[PDB]
Design a protein around this ligand. Sequence first.
Ligand SMILES: *Cc1c(COP(=O)(O)O)cnc(C)c1O
Ligand SMILES: *Cc1c(COP(=O)(O)O)cnc(C)c1O
Lengths: 396, 396
Amino acid sequence: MFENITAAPADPILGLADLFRADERPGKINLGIGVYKDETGKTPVLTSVKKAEQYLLENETTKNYLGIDGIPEFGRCTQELLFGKGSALINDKRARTAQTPGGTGALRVAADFLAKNTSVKRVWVSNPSWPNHKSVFNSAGLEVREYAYYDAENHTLDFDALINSLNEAQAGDVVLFHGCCHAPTGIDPTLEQWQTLAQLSVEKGWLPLFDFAFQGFARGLEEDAEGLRAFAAMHKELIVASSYSKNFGLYNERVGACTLVAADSETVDRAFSQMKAAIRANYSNPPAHGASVVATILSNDALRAIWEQELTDMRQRIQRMRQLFVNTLQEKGANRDFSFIIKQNGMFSFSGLTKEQVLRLREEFGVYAVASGRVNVAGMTPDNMAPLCEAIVAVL
Amino acid sequence: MFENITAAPADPILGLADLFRADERPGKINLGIGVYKDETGKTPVLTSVKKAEQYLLENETTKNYLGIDGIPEFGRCTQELLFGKGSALINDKRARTAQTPGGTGALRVAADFLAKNTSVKRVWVSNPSWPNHKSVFNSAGLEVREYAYYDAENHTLDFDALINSLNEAQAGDVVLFHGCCHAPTGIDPTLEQWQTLAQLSVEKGWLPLFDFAFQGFARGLEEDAEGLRAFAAMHKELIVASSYSKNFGLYNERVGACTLVAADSETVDRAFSQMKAAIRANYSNPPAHGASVVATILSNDALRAIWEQELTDMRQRIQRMRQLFVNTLQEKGANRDFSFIIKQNGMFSFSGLTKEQVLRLREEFGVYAVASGRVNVAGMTPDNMAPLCEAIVAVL
Ligand SMILES: *Cc1c(COP(=O)(O)O)cnc(C)c1O
Ligand SMILES: *Cc1c(COP(=O)(O)O)cnc(C)c1O
């Protein structure tokens, strides 16, 4: 029954993981990490989460199942973070949040829900976008199309081509947006562009789907939410897939949420039930631990205070490295202009290196990066910055 | 886009949950709980798991992502539990285990894998079987058919009708088996019947899929695995979906596994990669916590010792209650024969009550049970047994 099963493709990034971890050269740097790392080159567990965990340890009395949609406090804390503490969506109760196993889980339950309960057949994804997008939607039967986004020359948001390609999209098509810290580019629409996008969106009848995995990594928790809120003020319906994987350093506890927004409570409840049936046909109910840690931190003043400090510390280090990167390259010197680096947000951005350049960077220097030239800024430390830039300069 | 979304149906059991928790009558008993409860009527967290957790708390240094298939020690411990410590499947390395979010997650990833990578179109499920089965397979596009199993009259395994209805199944059809503690009946094939089933299975070309959610609840960890091992000795290919949800009291940490078995390592690796791609299009990688707790307990002699004691304590209490049930009914007296109760394994069994009988049991006495007459034995305590039986007698 499985003898003619064709092997799945070499993971588009994980190959680097293994390849890298096979280099006896210890001056090696992996910039294709896809996860945050501190100046020690470590992905630690936040101090706030450890405290949250001793708390759960001392207070949990049962591991009994959570409801299909997870811990309730977790849902409210997430919609407050997304739409803001006093938002009308919240008061009018037109948003329902389901806790899910990471942001990918949120994206697949949306996909399944949308595919079994609506007429949507295609999903517009930016080109480029976080990889796993295509597989998730296709696996649910949604056709994926791509809209323009990135300007190779100016290393910028090609808004014109963007709004120009989105015009092929019909009413009822789902259009996927990264809320902040666009991956892999690091370019985000400015608030005005978010507002025009919202307006065009309402006019064309797009169903917006927000992938919000980096809240707090661009400017702050509230600022990062402005684009989504720009849409939420405009739309009757939207879906948001959030992840706490990164802003809480809870990668492996699979904590995320899929929030549905409809015109009124009555329709959101009706649509949510089918989203619940989609959850029940998949993994049944979600993993309590990670979501539990988030809910206790966000609901505790002292713990939330420490976390936010931890998040800004992370945000700032990423900002420091982009900054230190740009001028250490201008110190090691080469006809360049990696200044767009400083204007980009989040952990990733396209270095602008060609596949041959990244190749010799790996093979000849021990610097590992994705073939697309994508580079993870959090992989740089004040200590590995110099050799990094030397290698970078030696291949330009 | 969601205004004409039709509401999902009232959850076939959860309705009772809410209904029950709305009865000011405190002599009420919920027998439709679907989860284990101790004599206190509590679903506690095992002592062994709490210790495992203080350990993780003191030793974890990163929440970084696990690989698509979860923690490796978790995989090996599970295949040892399933196939036995020295099994040929293990040595010949023809089994691959993916950690998943509960047994339902394991069942959906199998379904998705089987639907995208093989020619299977229908899945044979027993009638009756644990409910959520149909939704999972259908959601992956597999047609579900049912084979005969339960004998209403004798309250027994109607083997004849069983093997008779399975004859409609074609080669390449997937046939789903509960490894032990069949839900909802509590009737398991005897080892000889497991052996004849294995043999017919090989002859007809069925792909066996084992749903093994109650290992250790019937006779013991190894005994409970004999049927599956009876098949594993016979088949080139099989799939097993295990859950630790119940035997570890880890319901909400969503810990389970989907184990694939092929003819050789080479084909198991090839098929597993596609199963990994199916995991990546769903939730990406699994929740570490619950799986981490299991792996540390099972790999630690002192902790595994305590757990096993905890499991047998649970197994025995369920056995005590079935026993205490049967004769307290014979004490409160009624033309009955609930002796088949004592021959059934696990938490569930069909009481043999009609839907009208269960209805007045709820409405008139405060005893909640599923319309099918299914009763959860772990919901009975030495203290609520008397009124339980009185109510039962008053409606016969
Ligand atoms: C990280 C990420 C996700 C979510 O991943 P999880 O690890 O499953 O939480 C989704 N979209 C983008 C753009 C991401 O960066
Ligand atoms: C509990 C159970 C499952 C698995 O459920 P999870 O709670 O998702 O671990 C699967 N099959 C049967 C028969 C069950 O009893």
